[PDB]
């Protein structure tokens, strides 16, 4: 409830961090003391953030600074390139003077570098154990929190992805040729992604995400701006090429955005089969065809080829791995896997029946070779296990070397 005591506590802490000892730190926290009272005790402000910019040394020395720059003891703690913050958001509904200031007001000390590193550090990296320790310390609310921190991880992924006259004629040639060639390159990303490998369908989503990130980077890079103004001056060599590339870039960007958001809708029902159990995919497949069937009521060859070949690649990967880690277990797993392939083909043929009703090369090749190399081996093990009941009646006087014939046949 005491404005001045917490004012001088934040003066001392912002001096110990910043180096502005007494004069303008205390003057700026003193100035407009109605709001300084109206954050601490009263309603309205839930923090009073002193941000301090710099204009001469780019704040690199950090030991101390003049106040020629404009510091803002403003309500918002903004994230620009230039000002180091202190928020002192208070963890008390009413400002109580008796409670100390450094046990509820967290300091706002911020690296002068931009929005990549500090925020992912403060969200994902630093806070790893306490919730987990609180996971250890008695909660039922364990569910959906692990994937909540996987959402923090994908924040980290996307911020790492995204944040990372003769003289005039010379400048025009110097900044055009390079960037036009790069744009022409980036309009060929659909071609270097058709290759021979058992690849997984999430790499599709990641390829489209890289297309998004590079499109955003180039379109921001063009929006250096003096060279655009130089282009406007120099229309009276690349400007035919620039309007052509602009039309190409707009069409590519629009189809990329539509593809990314619709391919993003698919993820929560294709997700169980990447790492789960072999029988789970059987139940997942009706949901999977509800998703795919609704999405081809909208938008073709690239979707069909990449989606179906890679998803069937992943089914082969999961079945073959989950079998490889004896007899009754193996025969059971082969029965389960053949039933999985059978229900997949059955539901795709039902899908083709519906697709014909209302208004498959990869499947053929991949599951036909898998199912034939499973029928042969499942019949071999059924025969072996049917001959395996012989294996312990060793005292009958006519089953001694007979089993060694069976042993050679096995071996």
């Amino acid at each position: 409830m005491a404005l001045d005591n917490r004012h001088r506590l934040i003066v001392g802490k912002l001096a110990e961090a910043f180096g502005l000892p007494e004069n303008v730190i205390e003057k700026t926290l003193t100035q407009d003391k109605q709001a300084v009272n109206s954050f601490f005790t009263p309603a309205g402000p839930p923090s009073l953030v002193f941000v301090y910019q710099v204009k001469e040394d780019k704040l690199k020395d950090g030991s101390v600074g003049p106040v020629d720059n404009k510091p803002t003891l403003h309500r918002i703690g903004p994230h620009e390139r230039i000002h180091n913050s202190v928020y002192f958001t208070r963890l008390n509904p009413k400002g109580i003077n008796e409670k100390t200031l450094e046990a509820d007001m967290g300091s706002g000390e911020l690296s002068v570098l931009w929005a990549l590193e500090n925020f992912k550090a403060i969200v994902s990296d630093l806070y790893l154990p306490i919730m987990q320790e609180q996971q250890q310390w008695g909660k039922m609310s364990t569910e959906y929190l692990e994937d909540f921190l996987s959402s923090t991880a994908k924040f980290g992924s996307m911020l790492t992805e995204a944040v990372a006259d003769d003289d005039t004629l010379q400048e025009m040639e110097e900044c055009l040729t390079e960037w036009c060639r790069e744009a022409e390159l980036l309009l060929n990303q659909t071609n270097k992604i058709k290759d021979g490998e058992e690849r997984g369908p999430d790499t599709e989503l990641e390829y489209w995400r890289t297309r998004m990130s590079n499109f955003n980077s180039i379109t921001e890079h063009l929006k250096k701006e003096c060279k655009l103004v130089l282009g406007i001056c120099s229309h009276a060599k690349a400007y035919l090429r620039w309007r052509g590339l602009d039309v190409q870039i707009t069409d590519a960007a629009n189809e990329s955005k539509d593809n990314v958001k619709y391919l993003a809708t698919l993820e929560k029902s294709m997700e169980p089969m990447y790492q789960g159990r072999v029988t789970d995919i059987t139940e997942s497949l009706p949901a999977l065809m509800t998703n795919v069937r609704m999405m081809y009521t909208i938008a073709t060859a690239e979707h069909m080829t990449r989606l179906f070949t890679k998803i069937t690649n992943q089914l082969v990967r999961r079945c073959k791995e989950q079998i490889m880690e004896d007899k009754v277990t193996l025969i059971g797993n082969m029965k389960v896997s053949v039933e999985l392939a059978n229900v997949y083909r059955q539901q795709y043929r039902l899908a083709k029946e519906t697709l014909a009703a209302q208004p498959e090369q990869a499947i053929f090749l991949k599951f036909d070779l898998s199912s034939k190399a499973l029928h042969k081996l499942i019949d071999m093990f059924t025969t072996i296990h049917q001959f395996s009941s012989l294996e312990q009646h060793t005292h009958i006087e006519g089953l001694d070397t007979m089993l060694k014939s069976l042993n050679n046949i096995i071996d």
């Binding site: 690199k60 020395d61 030991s63 963890l91 967290g106 706002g108 925020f119 403060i122 630093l126 609180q134």
Partner: protein
């Protein structure tokens, strides 16, 4: 040199721990400053915790539940502390508060929506990614709001997206919310009334009408889910108002028959399962009771049991005057009765 980093971290620790003493030598002189120097001189080392228990210090990672603790986090952005370029501007110099979940809620709703707003205003993300970061920061807000407390007790389209996504999630939370029996139904009445005026309050009403400037599909679904809320709420209230050495306390069992007399003059399955609860109390008492006295105490034990089954047939005859439950009471209580007939004989 390591000395500029050492004295910088020392002056920061004297700033943030605020205990004037030579205690820096009393704790750090063991594993402390060696762990600090190996933290600063090794690759991949990205975190450090120091806890201030009022006056005491601990350089660690594991947070204890001791009150008045304070948290400071140290991270070198670089793998060493460089002699050439200054280390005073350390990328992570964090001081925090005792309770973590309150701070995460406060940081979500106070200090880091500027990261959502102003970098969106400046370069980098004018695309669908701005809509994405707004929506899942709203998800952050909703989650940190609900998982605390509930455990313990062109513009038009995107604004519609936010103000419909938060109710998709909150309805998932609501449908999750639809003496074990007594406390179960008391909790159900209390929680469902509390959510029922979490849904009929002012700002929710304005949100429903602002959304009803679109009138597309979702709002009949929230109408039907409110229909789910209200009847269960009132009926839970009704049965909560209804529900409000054993040799000395057989007359209490008359009270029990009278409760069944008075209540049923609800639904049958919970009635039979309440009888199961009564029988598990009776087995609790009949283990609480325990070579010639043993027959006497087991005679008393069967005597209480036959008053119990006699009150059952009294309730049956008075029901006739004013079928599976017999089999159920037989199952539980007769399993017990033959356990101790065997031991008594």
């Amino acid at each position: 040199v390591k000395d500029i980093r050492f004295d910088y971290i020392r002056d920061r620790v004297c700033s943030c721990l605020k205990v004037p003493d030579s205690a820096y030598d009393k704790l750090v002189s063991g594993d402390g400053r060696t762990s600090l120097v190996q933290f600063m001189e090794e690759a991949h080392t990205k975190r450090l915790l120091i806890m201030l228990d009022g006056k005491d210090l601990s350089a660690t990672v594991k947070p204890p539940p001791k009150f008045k603790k304070k948290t400071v986090y140290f991270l070198k952005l670089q793998e060493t502390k460089l002699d050439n370029d200054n280390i005073k501007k350390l990328v992570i110099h964090g001081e925090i508060s005792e309770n973590p979940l309150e701070t995460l809620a406060a940081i979500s709703q106070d200090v880091f929506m500027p990261v959502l707003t102003a970098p969106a205003n400046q370069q980098g993300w004018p695309d669908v990614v701005a809509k994405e970061v707004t929506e899942n920061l709203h998800k952050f807000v909703s989650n940190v709001f609900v998982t605390i407390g509930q455990m313990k007790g062109q513009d038009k389209i995107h604004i519609l997206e936010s103000a419909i996504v938060t109710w998709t999630k909150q309805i998932k939370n609501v449908l999750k919310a639809d003496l074990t029996e007594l406390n179960f139904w008391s909790e159900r009445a209390a929680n469902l009334n509390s959510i029922h005026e979490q849904l009929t309050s002012e700002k929710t009403q304005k949100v429903v009408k602002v959304l009803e400037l679109a009138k597309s599909t979702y709002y009949p679904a929230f109408q039907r889910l409110f229909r789910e809320v209200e009847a269960a709420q009132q009926e839970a209230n009704d049965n909560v108002k209804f529900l409000k050495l054993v040799d000395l306390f057989k007359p209490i069992m008359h009270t029990l028959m009278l409760i069944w007399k008075h209540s049923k003059s609800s639904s049958t399955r919970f009635v039979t399962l309440m009888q199961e609860i009564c029988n598990d109390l009776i087995m609790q008492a009949c283990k609480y009771v325990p070579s010639e006295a043993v027959d006497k105490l087991r005679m008393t034990l069967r005597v209480l049991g036959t008053f119990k089954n006699y009150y059952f047939e009294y309730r049956a005859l008075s029901m006739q005057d004013t079928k599976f439950q017999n089999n159920s009471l037989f199952a539980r209580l007769d399993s017990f009765l033959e356990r101790c007939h065997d031991m008594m004989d």
